[PDB]
Amino acid sequence: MTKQEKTALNMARFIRSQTLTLLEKLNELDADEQADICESLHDHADELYRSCLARFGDDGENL
Amino acid sequence: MTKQEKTALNMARFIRSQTLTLLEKLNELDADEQADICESLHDHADELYRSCLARFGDDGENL
C-alpha cells in the first residue's frame, strides 16, 4: 500500500539520518571514537532500513 | 559537561530508545525481521551512548 509500510521504512531511514548528523556533531567534539562507532551505527541503521525495504519494499503503488 | 556533550550523549541515548520502540512496534506491524535488526541497532546505538559517556562523561538529563 506504500502507506504505513513506508512509515516504518521512514523511521529506519530516519535513524540513519540521525546517525549521519550524529557523525557530524561527534566530529565537532573530536569524538573520532564515537565517529567510527557512529558510522558502524550508520550502516546498521541501514541494516534496519534495507531490511525494512525487504519487507516494505512495496514502494511503487505510489505513482 | 558542555551542553554539546550532553546533546551528543542524548542523541545516542535517543536512538537507543527510538530503536527500542521500533523493535516492538515493527514486530507488531509484522516486521519481526526488522525487529531483530532493531535489537542489534538498539544496543549498537547505545554503543554511542557508552563511548559518549567515556569521552564526555557528561550526563544529567534535566532542565
Swiss-Prot record, chains A, B:
Subunit-structure text: Antiparallel homodimer.
Protein name: Regulatory protein rop
Function per UniProt: Regulates plasmid DNA replication by modulating the initiation of transcription of the primer RNA precursor. Processing of the precursor of the primer, RNAII, is inhibited by hydrogen bonding of RNAII to its complementary sequence in RNAI. ROP increases the affinity of RNAI for RNAII and thus decreases the rate of replication initiation events.
GO MF terms held by the record: identical protein binding
Any Pfam family hit: Rop
Signal sequence region: none
Transmembrane regions: none
Originating gene: rop
Keywords of this entry: Plasmid, Transcription, Transcription regulation
